């Protein structure tokens, strides 16, 4: 999977989540288009591996 956004205009802040599934789906392309579209001047991103094969 899912892609989410929750904005706080009063703070110029946006909480974004790009949760993808599959080797042909790149969440980073989603990030690049949004950073641009929203004109963020500063970002912090954490990348999680959901459903690690060895975990499951």
């Amino acid at each position: 999977x899912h892609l989410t956004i929750h904005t706080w205009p009063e703070y110029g802040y946006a909480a974004i989540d790009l949760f993808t599934c599959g080797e042909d789906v790149d969440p980073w392309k989603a990030f690049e288009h949004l950073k641009k579209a929203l004109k963020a001047k500063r970002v912090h991103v954490v990348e999680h591996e959901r459903g690690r094969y060895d975990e499951i």
Binding site: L3, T4, H6, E10, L18, C21, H33, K35, I56
Partner: protein, 59 residues
């Protein structure tokens, strides 16, 4: 080596007009989905008052 890849992102100092434009956010979120290749299952966006927009694209 994992079923999925998840980016938890903090966007700062964004264009405040865009952040409060529900139709543009949806426009942009849907585009980001395209750029990623993701096959859109469903999309839902909300305009909260006085400010704020919540939106999700299930992929």
């Amino acid at each position: 080596k994992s079923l999925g890849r998840h980016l938890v992102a903090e966007f700062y100092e964004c264009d405040r007009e865009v952040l409060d434009n529900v139709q543009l956010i949806e426009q942009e979120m849907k585009q980001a989905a395209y750029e990623s290749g993701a096959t859109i299952v469903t999309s839902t966006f909300h305009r909260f008052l006085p400010y704020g927009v919540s939106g999700v694209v299930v992929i």
